[PDB]
Scaffold this active site. Structure first.
Site, short mmCIF file in Angstrom:
data_model
loop_
_atom_site.label_atom_id
_atom_site.label_comp_id
_atom_site.label_asym_id
_atom_site.label_seq_id
_atom_site.Cartn_x
_atom_site.Cartn_y
_atom_site.Cartn_z
N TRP A 183 37.80 32.26 26.85
CA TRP A 183 37.72 32.68 25.45
C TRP A 183 36.30 32.68 24.89
O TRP A 183 36.06 33.29 23.84
CB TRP A 183 38.66 31.84 24.55
CG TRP A 183 38.45 30.34 24.69
CD1 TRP A 183 39.21 29.47 25.43
CD2 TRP A 183 37.43 29.54 24.06
NE1 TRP A 183 38.72 28.19 25.32
CE2 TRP A 183 37.63 28.20 24.49
CE3 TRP A 183 36.35 29.82 23.21
CZ2 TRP A 183 36.81 27.13 24.08
CZ3 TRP A 183 35.53 28.76 22.78
CH2 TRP A 183 35.76 27.43 23.23
N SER A 261 37.75 26.24 32.81
CA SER A 261 37.59 24.78 32.96
C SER A 261 37.62 24.35 34.42
O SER A 261 38.24 25.00 35.26
CB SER A 261 38.68 24.04 32.19
OG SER A 261 39.93 24.17 32.85
N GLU A 288 34.14 29.80 38.46
CA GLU A 288 32.93 29.37 37.80
C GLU A 288 33.42 28.44 36.70
O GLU A 288 34.16 28.85 35.82
CB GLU A 288 32.15 30.60 37.33
CG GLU A 288 31.81 31.53 38.55
CD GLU A 288 30.82 30.88 39.56
OE1 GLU A 288 29.79 30.35 39.12
OE2 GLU A 288 31.05 30.92 40.78
N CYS A 322 29.31 27.08 28.76
CA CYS A 322 29.17 26.36 30.02
C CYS A 322 27.71 26.01 30.29
O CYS A 322 27.43 25.10 31.07
CB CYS A 322 29.71 27.19 31.16
SG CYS A 322 28.88 28.81 31.29
N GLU A 417 32.48 17.36 30.19
CA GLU A 417 32.20 18.53 29.37
C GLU A 417 33.05 18.54 28.10
O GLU A 417 34.27 18.76 28.15
CB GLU A 417 32.42 19.80 30.18
CG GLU A 417 31.96 21.05 29.45
CD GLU A 417 32.20 22.31 30.26
OE1 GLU A 417 31.23 23.09 30.40
OE2 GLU A 417 33.34 22.50 30.76
N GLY A 477 21.94 31.74 27.44
CA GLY A 477 21.65 33.15 27.28
C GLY A 477 21.06 33.85 28.50
O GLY A 477 20.26 34.76 28.34
N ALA A 478 21.47 33.42 29.70
CA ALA A 478 21.04 34.07 30.95
C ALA A 478 21.26 35.58 30.84
O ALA A 478 22.35 36.01 30.45
CB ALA A 478 21.80 33.52 32.15
N1 LIG Z 1 30.72 28.66 34.82
C1 LIG Z 1 30.86 29.68 33.98
O1 LIG Z 1 30.40 30.96 34.28
C2 LIG Z 1 31.53 29.50 32.65
C3 LIG Z 1 31.40 30.49 31.67
C4 LIG Z 1 32.18 30.44 30.51
C5 LIG Z 1 33.09 29.39 30.36
N2 LIG Z 1 33.19 28.43 31.34
C6 LIG Z 1 34.12 27.30 31.21
O2 LIG Z 1 35.28 27.62 30.48
C7 LIG Z 1 35.83 26.42 29.96
C8 LIG Z 1 36.38 26.69 28.57
O3 LIG Z 1 37.03 27.95 28.61
P1 LIG Z 1 38.64 28.05 28.65
O4 LIG Z 1 39.20 27.09 27.66
O5 LIG Z 1 39.00 29.49 28.58
O6 LIG Z 1 38.98 27.53 30.13
P2 LIG Z 1 40.49 27.35 30.68
O7 LIG Z 1 40.43 26.80 32.05
O8 LIG Z 1 41.26 26.46 29.79
O9 LIG Z 1 41.15 28.84 30.70
C9 LIG Z 1 40.47 29.91 31.35
C10 LIG Z 1 41.50 30.98 31.69
O10 LIG Z 1 42.42 30.46 32.64
C11 LIG Z 1 43.76 30.60 32.19
N3 LIG Z 1 44.56 29.48 32.75
C12 LIG Z 1 44.84 28.25 32.19
N4 LIG Z 1 45.58 27.55 33.09
C13 LIG Z 1 45.77 28.30 34.20
C14 LIG Z 1 46.45 28.08 35.42
N5 LIG Z 1 46.89 26.86 35.76
N6 LIG Z 1 46.44 29.06 36.39
C15 LIG Z 1 45.80 30.27 36.16
N7 LIG Z 1 45.14 30.48 34.96
C16 LIG Z 1 45.12 29.52 34.00
C17 LIG Z 1 43.66 30.69 30.68
O11 LIG Z 1 44.79 31.33 30.14
C18 LIG Z 1 42.36 31.47 30.52
O12 LIG Z 1 42.59 32.86 30.70
C19 LIG Z 1 34.72 25.38 29.98
O13 LIG Z 1 34.99 24.41 30.95
C20 LIG Z 1 33.51 26.15 30.43
O14 LIG Z 1 32.69 25.36 31.26
C21 LIG Z 1 32.44 28.47 32.47
#
Ligand SMILES: NC(=O)c1ccc[n+]([C@@H]2O[C@H](COP(=O)([O-])OP(=O)(O)OC[C@H]3O[C@@H](n4cnc5c(N)ncnc54)[C@H](O)[C@@H]3O)[C@@H](O)[C@H]2O)c1
Ligand SMILES: NC(=O)c1ccc[n+]([C@@H]2O[C@H](COP(=O)([O-])OP(=O)(O)OC[C@H]3O[C@@H](n4cnc5c(N)ncnc54)[C@H](O)[C@@H]3O)[C@@H](O)[C@H]2O)c1
Ligand code: NA
Ligand code: NA
Lengths: 516, 516
Positions: A183, A261, A288, A322, A417, A477-478
């Site tokens: 999101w 996550s 990621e 992230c 985090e 901001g990469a």
């Molecule tokens: N490393 C990166 O490039 C990067 C970039 C942006 C965000 N993030 C990470 O995103 C996290 C926050 O974003 P979030 O709340 O969307 O993460 P999230 O893990 O809660 O959800 C990410 C996506 O996975 C889906 N999802 C949830 N449970 C699932 C399951 N068990 N099986 C398959 N899909 C599932 C969600 O519906 C959503 O589309 C933070 O930990 C942040 O570090 C990482």
């Protein structure tokens, strides 16, 4: 095909009257469109469902930005059938033709940029410049991957010749895969994770984050207008642990592209390792998975420059990145001068409805607010609260910029985090200890150093073990193409987005010899 | 560093008196050394254990070819410690220095080629040309990866510049990993899987197959003499399900490089997907598994050429190759002419003790004999036995070249990897059906077509879904550099050995920006 050399889409700062006027009109139009319903997109058509998903305005959660259809297993099956049927012919398109399709999508997105920015403002609570950066990065992914894909075109592999034979090695796409998107960058990362695989001949089923389903639908409007063949890209808003888990575990899913996550990433990677009944390949999973990113400042730094970069890095988009600076590691000589400056800058930050273009909008959801406030309570018993640490007044999910100091390196708030506007300050003796503390987490995504000392910078280049390291500037901001983005350790699989290498992940190689 | 352009090491044919004399000399020296005991190699020293492993001559299994030490968990832990300690400095060697080390190892191997070939003859039952091809390929891996590694040297990544900044992206090795090697190419694949990761800065614990522990030890004599720093390469002969599983599942193993059976590959990939307690990364696992490889022949083919290539492909090294032709798919018009020629050629093949350079030596072990004979029993119920299908006289594990006809495409013998001298012949209507039958297995490693029809060849180039496809020649003996080797589907993860892309699998990328 010949296009101009890649350049990054400029990020709008809204300092001219023309830009402010355009943005006010875009915000007005998006606001006037609140309550719109967006169906699924499967096999080239919009497909509605009985059940629905609701997207709230985090700045005023009584307000429904929009609703979408809701995908379950049946819709997932339907999307998978469409994606595999499409793959059969999409894989055979000349690369030039697929790349032109991306370039068209980029042009269409660019023409809708203010609308998409305005949609981010209302749907996920980005201020104006954060929204513009997000849309600009999406455009960059499409432009960059369109060009990068040509570098893999038939037959791209450098091989050693053999007498009396033609030896020809070349890349082919994998098949139909699932994209599971976050999101926090729901135009940029959603777009990049889809168009990269698709550029080189894969087909994709895209599962947007629940909090960002409306803007995901608008990206699909763009894909549809661009004319991606039926089944090439599919849009399945739905619950992650339902439709997402169903696709991850499916024997006919070829690859999984995930950003989110660590908790979820770990489950996805584990599931991808298993052979589902009837499965006929080894699944690829790219995950990621966030960070616990530190900025180190030593006594040689420009302390004013450092303080500004720390504040941007820690509090941009409410710390919901992230890449966000959630740790500030100060050597003894830097501690007081830098902390004083960071506190002075941070206490001046405005917080309010994202439409007002505050320094910080709200966090994304009631659940996010709850988690962040929970971590603040934990923090109060681990370090010293010196700024913020409260939700502000209003229905919106507003949290004050928060700073803990004298935080033990192994404290929960120095290790886990939080993903909110919460900075943990850690005091260390010297640069050596700063590096030890920086490296001592499970993560390895972003990091920064403010220092004028060359030997400290070059030491960090070799030993500050993060995938994206920045000196004397913000750590967020990469830019696509400029800074290949992706981490080490539990920050994920090091799939470097916005880099030539990214597309290789979605290809396999064939070697064909003819003896004449 | 500047060396001659890569060329493949010539495979000795033993057509000269000098070559035959040199081989006889080497066979003598090797058998005079049958009493030798070879310890483990850990941290730059030979380390013995109380327990031992015995290696037998599959051509005369009452004859011991040598013994080795036997690693258990304690020795696995010791090797892991040595490998991580070494990694800390090995990673920092200039690439040119690591590449020169490989080049030295290759020179040493080249000077001991007859001795290694003779060891292959006695330990795993290769005839002379099979033995020479195996050692030559090992040399090729070392020469090729030494050169290929320089293509990744600091700072190798092409990035887009940004005003007022240096942006520098570069590769770094992953750490310490485990190599789990097969008995069928126990010089070539054993060497390649070790020296690829090591070339670019990783360190390795190598687990040779139980059946080929002596020749693995001799390869380590070469590594030792070349002067790899202590802990960079480690040798742990032992049981797959014991020491191998222990390392695969270990939280401090960074990557796994595996070549072997699908059964074991599936377990490894699944285990690699799990986060072991205290693990701080997502493990990488490369698994190259079996094949059920077919040669298609149509009515336009040179039938004599086809029969020769089929016999070489099916029965070279007794069919104990992941690349071996185990299926012969013949169109209506090709069936009788090709089958008659194949049978006439196959019935002339000699089988006996490997040192006598027969067409076929023994299969490798009593267990392999048991497996192959069992599949022969299954085959008698599924198809029509028309040649061989019998054990041959002597303690050596001699099995006759075997041909089954009228085999249904879904028969166990048409689907499952037998890994012995057993060819299943399948009759099809036309080329289209031949491709359908070729593709309809869980596997996707090697394949071949004999045909003069250009449209058939080019159709197979596009649609015969195997990683290594060959036209009008044998489907075995992929040459390093010339034919990137690796498959699709349940033939593994498509890690292309002997290709520039192979080394990328053992690197991660860092992006470092300095704002001036
Ligand atoms: N490393 C990166 O490039 C990067 C970039 C942006 C965000 N993030 C990470 O995103 C996290 C926050 O974003 P979030 O709340 O969307 O993460 P999230 O893990 O809660 O959800 C990410 C996506 O996975 C889906 N999802 C949830 N449970 C699932 C399951 N068990 N099986 C398959 N899909 C599932 C969600 O519906 C959503 O589309 C933070 O930990 C942040 O570090 C990482
Ligand atoms: N795909 C390729 O490039 C290729 C090349 C050569 C051989 N092979 C395959 O190798 C197979 C025959 O070789 P093999 O009999 O040595 O294979 P195998 O799976 O029986 O053994 C391979 C290695 O794995 C070890 N091992 C066994 N069980 C293990 C466990 N559970 N955990 C960790 N390690 C374990 C063994 O000790 C050995 O070192 C065939 O399927 C053949 O196709 C494939
Ligand atoms: Na929302
Ligand atoms: Na043996």
């Amino acid at each position: 095909m010949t296009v101009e050399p890649f350049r990054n889409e400029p990020i709008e700062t809204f300092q001219t009257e023309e830009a402010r006027r355009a943005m006010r009109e875009a915000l007005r139009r998006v606001r006037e469109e609140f309550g719109r319903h967006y169906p699924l997109y499967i096999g080239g058509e919009w497909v509605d469902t009985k059940e629905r998903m609701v997207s709230l305005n985090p700045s005023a959660p009584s307000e429904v930005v929009g609703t979408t259809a809701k995908a379950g297993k049946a819709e997932a099956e339907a999307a998978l059938e469409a994606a595999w049927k499409a793959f059969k012919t999409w894989k055979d398109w000349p690369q030039e033709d697929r790349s032109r399709l991306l370039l068209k999508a980029a042009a269409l997105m660019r023409r809708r940029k203010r609308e998409l920015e305005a949609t981010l403002v209302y749907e996920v609570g980005k201020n104006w410049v954060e929204a513009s950066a997000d849309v600009a990065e999406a455009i960059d992914f499409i432009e960059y991957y369109a060009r990068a894909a040509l570098r893999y075109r038939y037959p791209a592999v450098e091989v050693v010749p053999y007498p009396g034979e033609d030896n020809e090695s070349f890349y082919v796409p994998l098949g139909a895969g699932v994209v599971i998107a976050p999101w926090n960058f729901p135009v940029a990362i959603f777009t990049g994770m889809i168009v990269g695989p698709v550029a080189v001949g894969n087909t994709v089923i895209a599962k947007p984050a629940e909090d960002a389903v409306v803007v995901g639908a608008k990206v699909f409007e763009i894909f549809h207008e661009a004319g991606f063949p039926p089944g090439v890209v599919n849009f399945l808003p739905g619950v992650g642990e339902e439709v997402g888990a169903y696709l991850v575990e499916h024997p006919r899913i070829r690859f999984i592209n995930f950003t989110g996550s660590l908790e979820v990433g770990l489950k996805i990677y584990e599931a991808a390792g298993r052979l589902a009944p009837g499965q006929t390949w080894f699944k690829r999973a790219y995950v990621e998975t966030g960070g616990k990113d530190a900025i180190i400042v030593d006594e040689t730094a420009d302390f004013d420059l450092a303080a500004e970069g720390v504040v941007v890095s820690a509090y941009g988009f409410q710390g919901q990145k992230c890449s966000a600076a959630s740790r500030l590691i100060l050597t003894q000589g830097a501690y007081e001068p830098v902390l004083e400056r960071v506190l002075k800058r941070a206490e001046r930050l405005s917080v309010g409805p994202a439409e007002e273009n505050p320094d910080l909008g709200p966090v994304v959801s009631a659940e996010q607010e709850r988690k962040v406030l929970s971590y603040i309570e934990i923090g109060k018993n681990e370090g010293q609260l010196v700024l913020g640490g409260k939700r502000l007044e209003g229905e919106g999910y507003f949290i004050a910029p928060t700073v803990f100091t004298e935080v033990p390196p192994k404290a929960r708030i120095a290790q886990e985090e939080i993903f909110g506007p919460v900075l943990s300050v850690i005091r260390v003796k010297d640069f050596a200890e700063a590096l030890e503390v920086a490296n001592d987490t499970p993560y390895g995504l972003t990091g920064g150093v403010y220092s004028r000392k060359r030997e400290h910078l070059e030491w960090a280049r070799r030993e500050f073990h993060v995938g994206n390291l920045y000196f004397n500037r913000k750590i967020t901001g990469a830019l696509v193409g400029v800074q290949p983005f992706g981490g080490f350790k539990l920050s994920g699989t090091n799939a470097k987005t916005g880099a030539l290498d990214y597309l290789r992940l979605f290809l396999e190689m064939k070697a064909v010899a003819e003896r004449f």
